[PDB]
PDB file of C-alpha atoms and ligand atoms in Angstrom:
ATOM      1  CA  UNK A   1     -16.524   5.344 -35.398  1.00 49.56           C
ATOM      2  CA  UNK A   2     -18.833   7.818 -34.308  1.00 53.93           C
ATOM      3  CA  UNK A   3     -19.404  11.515 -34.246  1.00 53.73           C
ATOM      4  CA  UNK A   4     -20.074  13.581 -31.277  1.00 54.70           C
ATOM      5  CA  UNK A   5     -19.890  17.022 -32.029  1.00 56.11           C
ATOM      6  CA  UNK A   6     -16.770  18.119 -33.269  1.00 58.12           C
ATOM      7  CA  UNK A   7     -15.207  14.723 -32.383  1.00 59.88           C
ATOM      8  CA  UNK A   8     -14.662  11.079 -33.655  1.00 63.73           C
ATOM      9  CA  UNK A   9     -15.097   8.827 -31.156  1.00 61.29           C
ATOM     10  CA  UNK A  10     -12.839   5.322 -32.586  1.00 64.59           C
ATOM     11  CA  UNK A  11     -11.351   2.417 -30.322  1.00 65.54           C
ATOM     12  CA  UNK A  12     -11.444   1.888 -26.864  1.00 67.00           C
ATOM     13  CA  UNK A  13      -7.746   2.727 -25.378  1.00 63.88           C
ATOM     14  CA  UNK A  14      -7.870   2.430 -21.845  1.00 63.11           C
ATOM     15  CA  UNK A  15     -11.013   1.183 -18.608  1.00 63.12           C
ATOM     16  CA  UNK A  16     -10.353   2.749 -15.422  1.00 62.22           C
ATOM     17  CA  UNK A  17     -12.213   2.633 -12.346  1.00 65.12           C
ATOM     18  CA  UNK A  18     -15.076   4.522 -14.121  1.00 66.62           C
ATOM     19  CA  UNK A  19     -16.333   4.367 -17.586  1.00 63.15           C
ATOM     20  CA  UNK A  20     -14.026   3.719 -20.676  1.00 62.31           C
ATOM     21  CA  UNK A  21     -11.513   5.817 -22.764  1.00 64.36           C
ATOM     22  CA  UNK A  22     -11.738   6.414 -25.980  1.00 61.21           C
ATOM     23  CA  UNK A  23      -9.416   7.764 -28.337  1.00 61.87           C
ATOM     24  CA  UNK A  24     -10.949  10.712 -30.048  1.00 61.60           C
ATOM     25  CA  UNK A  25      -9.902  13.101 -33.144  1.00 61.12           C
ATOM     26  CA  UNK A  26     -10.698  16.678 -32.779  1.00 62.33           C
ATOM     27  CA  UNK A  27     -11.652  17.967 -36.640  1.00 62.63           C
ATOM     28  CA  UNK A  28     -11.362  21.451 -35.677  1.00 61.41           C
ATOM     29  CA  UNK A  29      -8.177  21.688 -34.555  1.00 62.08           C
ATOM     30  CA  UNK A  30      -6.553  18.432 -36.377  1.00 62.21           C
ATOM     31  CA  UNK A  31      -5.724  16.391 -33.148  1.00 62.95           C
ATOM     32  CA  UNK A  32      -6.261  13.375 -31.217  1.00 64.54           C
ATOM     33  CA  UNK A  33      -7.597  13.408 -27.677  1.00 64.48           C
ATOM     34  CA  UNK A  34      -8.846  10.968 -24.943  1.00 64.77           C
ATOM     35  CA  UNK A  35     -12.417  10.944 -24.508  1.00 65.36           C
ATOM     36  CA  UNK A  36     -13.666   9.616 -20.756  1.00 66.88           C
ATOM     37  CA  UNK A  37     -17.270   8.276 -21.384  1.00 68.78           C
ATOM     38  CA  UNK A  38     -19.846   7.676 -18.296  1.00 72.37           C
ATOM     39  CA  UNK A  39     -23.075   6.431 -18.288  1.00 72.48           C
ATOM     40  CA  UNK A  40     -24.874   8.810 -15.443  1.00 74.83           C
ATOM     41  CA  UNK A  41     -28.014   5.676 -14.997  1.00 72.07           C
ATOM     42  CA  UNK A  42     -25.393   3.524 -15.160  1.00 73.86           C
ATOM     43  CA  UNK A  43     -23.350   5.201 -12.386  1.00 73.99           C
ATOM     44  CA  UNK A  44     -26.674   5.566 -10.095  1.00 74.86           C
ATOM     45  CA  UNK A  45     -27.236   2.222 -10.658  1.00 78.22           C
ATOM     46  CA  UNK A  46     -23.753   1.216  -9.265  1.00 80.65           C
ATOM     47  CA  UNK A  47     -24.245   3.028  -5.765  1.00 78.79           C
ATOM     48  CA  UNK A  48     -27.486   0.807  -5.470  1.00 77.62           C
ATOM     49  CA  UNK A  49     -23.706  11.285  -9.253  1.00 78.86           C
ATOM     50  CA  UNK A  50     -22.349  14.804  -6.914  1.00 78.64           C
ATOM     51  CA  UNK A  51     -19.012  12.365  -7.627  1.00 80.18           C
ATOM     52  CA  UNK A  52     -18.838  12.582 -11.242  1.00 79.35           C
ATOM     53  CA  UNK A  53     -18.608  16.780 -11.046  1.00 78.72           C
ATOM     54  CA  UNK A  54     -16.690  16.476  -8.109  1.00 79.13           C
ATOM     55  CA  UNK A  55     -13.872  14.854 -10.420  1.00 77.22           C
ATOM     56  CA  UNK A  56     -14.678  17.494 -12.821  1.00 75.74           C
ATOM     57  CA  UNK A  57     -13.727  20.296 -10.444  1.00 77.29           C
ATOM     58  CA  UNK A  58     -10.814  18.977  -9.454  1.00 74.75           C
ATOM     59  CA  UNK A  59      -9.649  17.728 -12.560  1.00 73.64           C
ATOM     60  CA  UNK A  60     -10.041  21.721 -13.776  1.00 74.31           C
ATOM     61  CA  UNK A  61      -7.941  22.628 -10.797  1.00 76.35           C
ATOM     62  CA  UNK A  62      -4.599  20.801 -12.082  1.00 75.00           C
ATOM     63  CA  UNK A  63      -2.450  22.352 -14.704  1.00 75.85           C
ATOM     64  CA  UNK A  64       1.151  19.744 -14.235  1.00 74.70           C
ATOM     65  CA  UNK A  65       3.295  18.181 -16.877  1.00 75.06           C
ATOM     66  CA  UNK A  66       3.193  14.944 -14.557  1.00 73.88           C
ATOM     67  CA  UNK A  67      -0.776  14.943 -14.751  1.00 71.40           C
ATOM     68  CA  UNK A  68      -3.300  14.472 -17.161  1.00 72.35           C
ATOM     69  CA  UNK A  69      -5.076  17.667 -18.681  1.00 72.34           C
ATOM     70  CA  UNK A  70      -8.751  17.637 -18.741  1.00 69.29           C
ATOM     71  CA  UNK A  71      -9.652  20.557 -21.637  1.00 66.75           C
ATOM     72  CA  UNK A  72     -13.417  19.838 -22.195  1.00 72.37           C
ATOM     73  CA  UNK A  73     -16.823  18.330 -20.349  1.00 75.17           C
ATOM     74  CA  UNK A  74     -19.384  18.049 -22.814  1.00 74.87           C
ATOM     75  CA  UNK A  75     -22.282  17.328 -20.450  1.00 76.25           C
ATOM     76  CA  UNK A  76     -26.401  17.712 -21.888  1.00 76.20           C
ATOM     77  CA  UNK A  77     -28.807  17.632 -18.785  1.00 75.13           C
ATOM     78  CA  UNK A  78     -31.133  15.497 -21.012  1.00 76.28           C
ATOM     79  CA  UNK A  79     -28.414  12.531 -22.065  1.00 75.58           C
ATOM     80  CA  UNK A  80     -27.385   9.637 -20.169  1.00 75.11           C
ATOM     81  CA  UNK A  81     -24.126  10.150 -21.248  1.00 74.33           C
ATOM     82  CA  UNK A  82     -21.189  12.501 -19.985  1.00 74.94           C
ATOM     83  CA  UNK A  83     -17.738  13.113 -22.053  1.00 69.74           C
ATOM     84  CA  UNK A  84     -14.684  14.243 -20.407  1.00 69.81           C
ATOM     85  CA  UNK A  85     -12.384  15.023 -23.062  1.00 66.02           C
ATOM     86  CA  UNK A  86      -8.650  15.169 -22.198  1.00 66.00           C
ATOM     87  CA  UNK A  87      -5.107  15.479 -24.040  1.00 63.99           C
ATOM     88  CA  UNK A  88      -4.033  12.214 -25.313  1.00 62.42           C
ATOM     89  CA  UNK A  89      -0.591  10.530 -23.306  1.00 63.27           C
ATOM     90  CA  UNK A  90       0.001   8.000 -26.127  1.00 65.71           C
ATOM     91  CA  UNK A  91       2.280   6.041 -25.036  1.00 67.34           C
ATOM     92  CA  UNK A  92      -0.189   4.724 -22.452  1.00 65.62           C
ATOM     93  CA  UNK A  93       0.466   2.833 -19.046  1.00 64.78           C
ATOM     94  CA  UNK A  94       3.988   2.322 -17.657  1.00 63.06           C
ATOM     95  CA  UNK A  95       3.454  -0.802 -16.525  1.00 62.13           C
ATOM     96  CA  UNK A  96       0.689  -3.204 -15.678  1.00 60.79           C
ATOM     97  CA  UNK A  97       1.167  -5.824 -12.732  1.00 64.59           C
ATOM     98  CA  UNK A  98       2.221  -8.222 -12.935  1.00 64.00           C
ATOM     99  CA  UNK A  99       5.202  -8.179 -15.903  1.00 65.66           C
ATOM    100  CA  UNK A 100       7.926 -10.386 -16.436  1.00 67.39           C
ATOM    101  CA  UNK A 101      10.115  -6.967 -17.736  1.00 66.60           C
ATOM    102  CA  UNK A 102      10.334  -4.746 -14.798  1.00 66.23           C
ATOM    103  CA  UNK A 103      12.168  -1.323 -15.322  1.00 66.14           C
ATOM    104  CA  UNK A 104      15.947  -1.222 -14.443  1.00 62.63           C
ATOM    105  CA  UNK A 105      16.792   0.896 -11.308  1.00 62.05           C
ATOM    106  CA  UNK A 106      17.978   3.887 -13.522  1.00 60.43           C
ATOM    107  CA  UNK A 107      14.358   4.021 -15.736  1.00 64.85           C
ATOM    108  CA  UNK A 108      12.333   3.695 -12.118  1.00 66.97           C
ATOM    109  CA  UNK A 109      14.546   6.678 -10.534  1.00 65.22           C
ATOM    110  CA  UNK A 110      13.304   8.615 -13.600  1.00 63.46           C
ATOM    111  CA  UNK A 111       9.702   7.794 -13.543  1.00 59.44           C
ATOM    112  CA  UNK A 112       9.783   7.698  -9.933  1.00 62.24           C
ATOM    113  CA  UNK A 113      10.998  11.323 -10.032  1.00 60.26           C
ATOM    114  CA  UNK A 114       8.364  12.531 -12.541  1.00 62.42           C
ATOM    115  CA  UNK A 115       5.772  10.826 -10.180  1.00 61.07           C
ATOM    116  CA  UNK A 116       6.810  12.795  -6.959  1.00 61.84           C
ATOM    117  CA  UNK A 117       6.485  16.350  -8.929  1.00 64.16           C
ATOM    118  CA  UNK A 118       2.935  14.798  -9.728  1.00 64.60           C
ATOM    119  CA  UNK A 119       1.914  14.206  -6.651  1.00 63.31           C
ATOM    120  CA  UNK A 120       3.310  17.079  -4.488  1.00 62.36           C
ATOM    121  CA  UNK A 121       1.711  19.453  -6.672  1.00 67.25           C
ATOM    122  CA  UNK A 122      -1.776  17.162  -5.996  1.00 66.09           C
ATOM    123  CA  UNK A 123      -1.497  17.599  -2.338  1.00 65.64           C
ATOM    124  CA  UNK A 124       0.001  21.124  -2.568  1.00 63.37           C
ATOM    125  CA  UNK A 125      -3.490  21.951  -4.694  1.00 62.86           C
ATOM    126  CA  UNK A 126      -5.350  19.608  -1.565  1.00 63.70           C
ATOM    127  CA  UNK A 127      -5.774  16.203  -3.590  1.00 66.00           C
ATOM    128  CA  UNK A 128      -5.805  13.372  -2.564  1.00 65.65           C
ATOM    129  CA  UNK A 129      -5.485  10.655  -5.367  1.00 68.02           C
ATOM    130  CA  UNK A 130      -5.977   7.925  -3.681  1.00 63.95           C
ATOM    131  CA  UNK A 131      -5.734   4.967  -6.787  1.00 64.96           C
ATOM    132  CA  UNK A 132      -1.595   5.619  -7.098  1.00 63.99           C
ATOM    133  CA  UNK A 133      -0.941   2.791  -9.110  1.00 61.98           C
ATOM    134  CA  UNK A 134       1.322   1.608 -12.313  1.00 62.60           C
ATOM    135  CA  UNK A 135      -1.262   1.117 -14.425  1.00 65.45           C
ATOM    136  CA  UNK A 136      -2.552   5.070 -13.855  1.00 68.63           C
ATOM    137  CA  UNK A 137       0.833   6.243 -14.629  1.00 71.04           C
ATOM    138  CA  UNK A 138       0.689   7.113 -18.503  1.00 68.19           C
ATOM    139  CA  UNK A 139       3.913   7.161 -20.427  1.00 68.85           C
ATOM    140  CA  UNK A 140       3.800  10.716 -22.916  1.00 69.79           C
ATOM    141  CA  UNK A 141       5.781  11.133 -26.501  1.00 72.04           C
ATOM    142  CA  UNK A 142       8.214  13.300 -24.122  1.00 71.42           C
ATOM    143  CA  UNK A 143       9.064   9.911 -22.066  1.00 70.13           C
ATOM    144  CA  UNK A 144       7.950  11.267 -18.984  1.00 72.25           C
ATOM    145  CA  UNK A 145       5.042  10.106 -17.128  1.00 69.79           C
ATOM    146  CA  UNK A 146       1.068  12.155 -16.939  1.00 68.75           C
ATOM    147  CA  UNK A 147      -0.684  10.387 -13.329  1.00 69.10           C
ATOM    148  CA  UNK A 148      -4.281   9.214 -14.396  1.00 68.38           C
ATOM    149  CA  UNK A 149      -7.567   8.578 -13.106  1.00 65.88           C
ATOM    150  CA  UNK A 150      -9.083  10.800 -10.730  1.00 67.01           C
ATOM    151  CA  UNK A 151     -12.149   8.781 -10.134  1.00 67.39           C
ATOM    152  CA  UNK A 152     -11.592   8.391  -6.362  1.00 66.99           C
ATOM    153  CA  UNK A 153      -9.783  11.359  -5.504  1.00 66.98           C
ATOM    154  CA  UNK A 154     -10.861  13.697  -3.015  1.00 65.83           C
ATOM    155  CA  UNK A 155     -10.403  17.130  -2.204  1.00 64.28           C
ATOM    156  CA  UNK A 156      -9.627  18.257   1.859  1.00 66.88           C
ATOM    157  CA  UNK A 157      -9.671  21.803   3.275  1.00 65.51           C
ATOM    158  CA  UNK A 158      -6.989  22.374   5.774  1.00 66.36           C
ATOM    159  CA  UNK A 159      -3.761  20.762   6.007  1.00 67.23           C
ATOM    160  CA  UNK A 160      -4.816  16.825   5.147  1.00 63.46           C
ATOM    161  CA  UNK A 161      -7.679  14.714   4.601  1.00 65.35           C
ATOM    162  CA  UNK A 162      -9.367  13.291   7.923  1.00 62.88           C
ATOM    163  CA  UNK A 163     -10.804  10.033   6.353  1.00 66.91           C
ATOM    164  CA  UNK A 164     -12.726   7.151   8.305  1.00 67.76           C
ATOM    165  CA  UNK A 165     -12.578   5.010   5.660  1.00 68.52           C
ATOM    166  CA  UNK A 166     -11.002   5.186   2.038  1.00 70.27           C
ATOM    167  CA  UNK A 167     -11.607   3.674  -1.721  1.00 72.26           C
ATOM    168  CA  UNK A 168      -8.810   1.997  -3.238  1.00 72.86           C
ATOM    169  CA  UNK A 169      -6.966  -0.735  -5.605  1.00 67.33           C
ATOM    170  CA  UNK A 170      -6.677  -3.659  -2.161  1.00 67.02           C
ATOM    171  CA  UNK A 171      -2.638  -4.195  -3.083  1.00 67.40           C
ATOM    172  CA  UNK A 172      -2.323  -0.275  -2.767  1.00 69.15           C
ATOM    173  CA  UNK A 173      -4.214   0.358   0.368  1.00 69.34           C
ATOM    174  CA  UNK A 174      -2.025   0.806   3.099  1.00 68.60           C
ATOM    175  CA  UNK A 175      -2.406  -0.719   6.705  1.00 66.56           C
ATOM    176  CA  UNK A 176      -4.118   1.775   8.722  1.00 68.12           C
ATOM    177  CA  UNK A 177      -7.503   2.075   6.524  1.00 69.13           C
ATOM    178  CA  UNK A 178      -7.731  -2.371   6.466  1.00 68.88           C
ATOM    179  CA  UNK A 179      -8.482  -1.844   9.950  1.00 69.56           C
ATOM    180  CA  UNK A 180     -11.823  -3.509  11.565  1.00 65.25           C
ATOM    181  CA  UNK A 181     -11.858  -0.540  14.441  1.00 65.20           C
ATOM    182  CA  UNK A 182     -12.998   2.884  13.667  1.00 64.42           C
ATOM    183  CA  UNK A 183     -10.654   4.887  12.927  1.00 63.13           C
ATOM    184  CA  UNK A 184      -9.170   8.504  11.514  1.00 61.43           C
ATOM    185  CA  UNK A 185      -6.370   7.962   9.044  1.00 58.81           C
ATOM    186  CA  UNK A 186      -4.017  10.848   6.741  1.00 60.02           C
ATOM    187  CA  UNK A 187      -5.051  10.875   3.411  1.00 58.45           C
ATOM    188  CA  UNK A 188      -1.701  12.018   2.377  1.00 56.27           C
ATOM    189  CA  UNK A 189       0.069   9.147   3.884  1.00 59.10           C
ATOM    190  CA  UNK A 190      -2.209   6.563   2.081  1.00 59.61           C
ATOM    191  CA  UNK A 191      -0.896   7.908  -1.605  1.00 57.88           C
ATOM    192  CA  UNK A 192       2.460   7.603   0.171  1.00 58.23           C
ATOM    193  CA  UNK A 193       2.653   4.279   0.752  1.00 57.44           C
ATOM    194  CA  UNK A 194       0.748   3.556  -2.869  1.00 53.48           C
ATOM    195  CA  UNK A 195       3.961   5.320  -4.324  1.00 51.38           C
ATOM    196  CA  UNK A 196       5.627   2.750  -2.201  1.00 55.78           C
ATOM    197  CA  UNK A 197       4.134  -0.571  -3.397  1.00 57.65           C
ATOM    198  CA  UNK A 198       4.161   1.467  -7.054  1.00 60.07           C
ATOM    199  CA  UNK A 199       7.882   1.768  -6.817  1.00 56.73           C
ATOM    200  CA  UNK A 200       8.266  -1.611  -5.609  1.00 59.33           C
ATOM    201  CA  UNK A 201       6.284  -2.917  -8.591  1.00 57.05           C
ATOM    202  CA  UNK A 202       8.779  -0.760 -10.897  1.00 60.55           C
ATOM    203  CA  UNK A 203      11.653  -2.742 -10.050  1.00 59.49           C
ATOM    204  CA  UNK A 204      10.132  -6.053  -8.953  1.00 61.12           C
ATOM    205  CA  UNK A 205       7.634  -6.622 -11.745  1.00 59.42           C
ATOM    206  CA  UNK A 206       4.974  -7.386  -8.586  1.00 58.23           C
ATOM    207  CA  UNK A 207       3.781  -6.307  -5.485  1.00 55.31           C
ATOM    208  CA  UNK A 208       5.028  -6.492  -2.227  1.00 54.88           C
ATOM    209  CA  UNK A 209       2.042  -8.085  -0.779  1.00 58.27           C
ATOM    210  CA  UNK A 210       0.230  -9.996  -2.782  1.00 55.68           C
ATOM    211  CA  UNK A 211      -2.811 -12.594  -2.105  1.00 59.62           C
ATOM    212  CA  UNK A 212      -5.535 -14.196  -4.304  1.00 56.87           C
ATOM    213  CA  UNK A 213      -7.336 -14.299  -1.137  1.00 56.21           C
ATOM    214  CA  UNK A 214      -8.881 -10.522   0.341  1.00 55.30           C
ATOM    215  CA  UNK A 215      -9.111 -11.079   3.940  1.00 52.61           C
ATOM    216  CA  UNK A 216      -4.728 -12.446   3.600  1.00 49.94           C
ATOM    217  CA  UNK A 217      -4.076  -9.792   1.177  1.00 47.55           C
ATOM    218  CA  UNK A 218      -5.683  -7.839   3.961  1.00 48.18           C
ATOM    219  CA  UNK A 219      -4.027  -9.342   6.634  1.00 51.28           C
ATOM    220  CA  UNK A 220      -0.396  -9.514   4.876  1.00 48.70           C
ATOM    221  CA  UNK A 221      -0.560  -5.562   4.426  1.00 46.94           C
ATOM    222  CA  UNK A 222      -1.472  -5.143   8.148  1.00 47.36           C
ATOM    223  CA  UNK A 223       1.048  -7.597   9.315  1.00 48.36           C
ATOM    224  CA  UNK A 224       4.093  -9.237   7.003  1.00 52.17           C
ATOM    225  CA  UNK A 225       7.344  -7.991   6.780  1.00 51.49           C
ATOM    226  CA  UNK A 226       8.151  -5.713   3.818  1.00 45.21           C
ATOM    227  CA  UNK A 227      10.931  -8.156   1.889  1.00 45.54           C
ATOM    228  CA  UNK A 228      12.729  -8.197  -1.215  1.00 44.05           C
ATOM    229  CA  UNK A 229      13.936 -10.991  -3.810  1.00 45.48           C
ATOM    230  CA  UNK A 230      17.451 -12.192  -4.451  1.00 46.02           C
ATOM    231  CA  UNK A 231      17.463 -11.133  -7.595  1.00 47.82           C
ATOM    232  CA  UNK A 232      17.194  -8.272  -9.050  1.00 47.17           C
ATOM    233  CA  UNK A 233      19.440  -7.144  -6.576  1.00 49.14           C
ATOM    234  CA  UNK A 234      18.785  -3.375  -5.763  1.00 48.59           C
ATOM    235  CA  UNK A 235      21.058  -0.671  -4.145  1.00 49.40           C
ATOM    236  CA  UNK A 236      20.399  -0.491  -0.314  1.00 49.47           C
ATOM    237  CA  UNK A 237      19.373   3.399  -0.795  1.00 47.85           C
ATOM    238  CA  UNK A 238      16.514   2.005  -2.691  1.00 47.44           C
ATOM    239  CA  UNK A 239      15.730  -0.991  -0.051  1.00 46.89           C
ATOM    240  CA  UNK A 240      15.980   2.028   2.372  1.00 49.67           C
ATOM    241  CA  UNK A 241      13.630   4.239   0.835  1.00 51.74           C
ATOM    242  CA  UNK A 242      10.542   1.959  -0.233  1.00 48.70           C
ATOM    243  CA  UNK A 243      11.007   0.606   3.414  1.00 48.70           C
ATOM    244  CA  UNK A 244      10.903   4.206   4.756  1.00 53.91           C
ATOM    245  CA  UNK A 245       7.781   4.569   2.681  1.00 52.49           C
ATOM    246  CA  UNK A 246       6.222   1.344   3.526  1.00 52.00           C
ATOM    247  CA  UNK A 247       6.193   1.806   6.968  1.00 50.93           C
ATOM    248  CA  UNK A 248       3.151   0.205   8.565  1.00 48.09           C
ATOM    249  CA  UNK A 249       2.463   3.179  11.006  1.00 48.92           C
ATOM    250  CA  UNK A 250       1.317   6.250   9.003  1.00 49.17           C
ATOM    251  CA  UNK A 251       2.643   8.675  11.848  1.00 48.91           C
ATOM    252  CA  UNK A 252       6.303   7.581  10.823  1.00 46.32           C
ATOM    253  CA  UNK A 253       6.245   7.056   7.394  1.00 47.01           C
ATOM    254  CA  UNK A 254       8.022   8.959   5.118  1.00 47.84           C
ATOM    255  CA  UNK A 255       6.675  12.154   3.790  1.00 48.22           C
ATOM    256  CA  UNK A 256       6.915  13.782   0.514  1.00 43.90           C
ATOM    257  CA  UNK A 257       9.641  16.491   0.986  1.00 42.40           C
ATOM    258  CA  UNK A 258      11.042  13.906   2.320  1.00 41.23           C
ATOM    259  CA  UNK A 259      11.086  11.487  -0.337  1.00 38.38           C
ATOM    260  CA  UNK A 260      12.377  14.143  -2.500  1.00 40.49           C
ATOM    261  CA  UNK A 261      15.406  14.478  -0.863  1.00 39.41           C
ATOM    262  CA  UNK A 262      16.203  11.153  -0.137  1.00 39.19           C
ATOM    263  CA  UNK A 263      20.003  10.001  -1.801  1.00 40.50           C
ATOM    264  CA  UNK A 264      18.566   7.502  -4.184  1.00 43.75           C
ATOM    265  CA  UNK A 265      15.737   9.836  -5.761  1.00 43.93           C
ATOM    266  CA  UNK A 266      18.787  12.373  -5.878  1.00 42.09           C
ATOM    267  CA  UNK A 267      21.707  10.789  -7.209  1.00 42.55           C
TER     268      UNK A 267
HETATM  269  O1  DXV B   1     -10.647   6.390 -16.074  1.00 42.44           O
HETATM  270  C1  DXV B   1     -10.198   7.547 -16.044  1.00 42.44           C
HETATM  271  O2  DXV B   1     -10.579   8.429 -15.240  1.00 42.44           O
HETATM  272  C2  DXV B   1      -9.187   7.948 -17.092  1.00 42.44           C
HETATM  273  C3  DXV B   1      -9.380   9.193 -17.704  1.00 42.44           C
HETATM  274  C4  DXV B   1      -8.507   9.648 -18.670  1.00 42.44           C
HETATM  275  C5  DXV B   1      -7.450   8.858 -19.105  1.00 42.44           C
HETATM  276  C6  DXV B   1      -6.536   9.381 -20.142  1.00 42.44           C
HETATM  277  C7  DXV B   1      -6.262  10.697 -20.396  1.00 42.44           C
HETATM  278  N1  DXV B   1      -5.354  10.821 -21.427  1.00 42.44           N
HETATM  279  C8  DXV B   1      -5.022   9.579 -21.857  1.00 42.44           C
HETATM  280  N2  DXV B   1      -4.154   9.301 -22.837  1.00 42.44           N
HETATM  281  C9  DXV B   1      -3.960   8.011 -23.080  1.00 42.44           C
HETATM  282  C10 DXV B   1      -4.621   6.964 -22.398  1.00 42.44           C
HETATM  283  C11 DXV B   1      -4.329   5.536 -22.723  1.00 42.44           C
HETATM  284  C12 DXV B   1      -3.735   5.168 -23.929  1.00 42.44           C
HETATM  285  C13 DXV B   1      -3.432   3.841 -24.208  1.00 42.44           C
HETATM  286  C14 DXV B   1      -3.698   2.858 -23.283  1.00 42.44           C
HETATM  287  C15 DXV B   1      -4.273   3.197 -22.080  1.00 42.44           C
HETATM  288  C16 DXV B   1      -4.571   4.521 -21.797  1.00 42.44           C
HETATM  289  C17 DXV B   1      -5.522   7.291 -21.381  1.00 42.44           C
HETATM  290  C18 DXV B   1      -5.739   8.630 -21.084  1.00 42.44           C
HETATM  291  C19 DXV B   1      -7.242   7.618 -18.499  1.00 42.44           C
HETATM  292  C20 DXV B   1      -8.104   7.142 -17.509  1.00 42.44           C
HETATM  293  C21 DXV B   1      -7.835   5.794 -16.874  1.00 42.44           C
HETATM  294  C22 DXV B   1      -8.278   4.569 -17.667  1.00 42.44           C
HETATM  295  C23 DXV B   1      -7.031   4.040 -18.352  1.00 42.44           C
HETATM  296  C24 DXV B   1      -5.892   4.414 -17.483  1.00 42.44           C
HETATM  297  C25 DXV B   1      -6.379   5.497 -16.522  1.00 42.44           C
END
């Protein structure tokens, strides 16, 4: 281990888009933490950061059970290093993709639920997440689920984010920001239809367009019908709603309030 102020820094727990995760033990107050670690040089050197504290700001913003708590920066001007300490969601990821156990219909309704309070409280405080993903869904000691990583998000000012182009996980990013054609695109829609492929992946084990090649991955997104597997065989409310939120155009996908009252997220 090592000490940084009043913490022990021990094993690496998680690597997210940024940085690592450590897990950390507070000896003031007798508890563990998660400890986000960034190299600023390291961080310069990767654009070839106003980023880094952009996260921070928004990350102070959000007080949810459904997202992760940031409760300390430790930050010296003359350090390479910054320390985003946050509480700890032990149980970790809900899934990573692909798995050979996929959740039954009745766990993914739960989760799925937990992630919709998550997310319409993000875009009711004007984030965008933009990485909406299994693996960034943490699994708490309460069983529900804490939505991670806030390394791309963004922050708009009116009603939605007006994006020309857009960072993301390539499975995740949905068809209107692959385009070669200059565009404007909701930022609210894209985390839609990453809840999509993320609910797909729930009960599927996989994703619903997958490629080891970019520029087919690309083109399957864009252009390949949304389909589903023999088996497991799902209810058709569920069919109905990921293809409601996979919907290739953004101006008739599915929307959050929505989603929330859809029959299968409600029975
Ligand atoms: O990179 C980030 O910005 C980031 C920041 C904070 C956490 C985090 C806050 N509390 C946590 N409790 C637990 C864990 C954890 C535990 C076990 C295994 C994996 C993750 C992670 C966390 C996680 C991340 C990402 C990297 C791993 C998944 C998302």
């Amino acid at each position: 281990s090592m000490q940084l102020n009043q913490y022990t820094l021990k094993d690496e727990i998680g690597k997210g888009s940024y940085g690592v995760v450590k897990l950390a033990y507070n000896e003031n107050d007798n508890t563990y933490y998660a400890m986000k670690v960034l190299s600023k040089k390291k961080l310069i050197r990767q654009a070839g950061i106003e980023q880094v504290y952009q996260e921070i700001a928004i990350l102070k913003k959000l007080d949810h059970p459904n997202v992760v708590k940031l409760v300390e920066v430790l930050d010296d001007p003359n350090e390479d290093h910054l320390y985003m300490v946050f509480e700890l969601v032990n149980q970790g990821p809900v899934m990573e993709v692909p798995t050979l156990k996929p959740l039954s219909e009745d766990q993914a309704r739960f989760y799925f639920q937990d992630l919709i309070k998550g997310i319409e409280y993000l875009h009711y405080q004007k984030i965008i997440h933009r990485d909406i993903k299994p693996s960034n869904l943490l699994v708490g000691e309460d069983g529900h689920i804490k939505i991670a990583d806030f390394g791309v998000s963004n922050e708009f000012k009116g009603s939605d984010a007006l994006l020309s182009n857009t960072v993301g996980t390539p499975a995740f990013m949905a068809p209107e920001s692959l385009s070669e054609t200059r565009k404007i695109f909701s930022g609210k829609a894209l985390d839609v239809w990453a809840m999509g492929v993320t609910l797909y992946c729930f009960v599927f084990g996989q994703c619903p367009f997958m490629d080891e090649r970019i520029m087919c991955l690309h083109s399957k997104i864009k252009s390949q019908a949304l389909e589903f597997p023999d088996q497991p065989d799902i209810a058709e409310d569920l069919k109905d709603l990921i293809t409601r939120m996979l919907d290739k155009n953004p101006e008739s996908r599915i929307v959050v309030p929505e989603i929330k009252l859809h029959p299968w997220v409600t029975r």
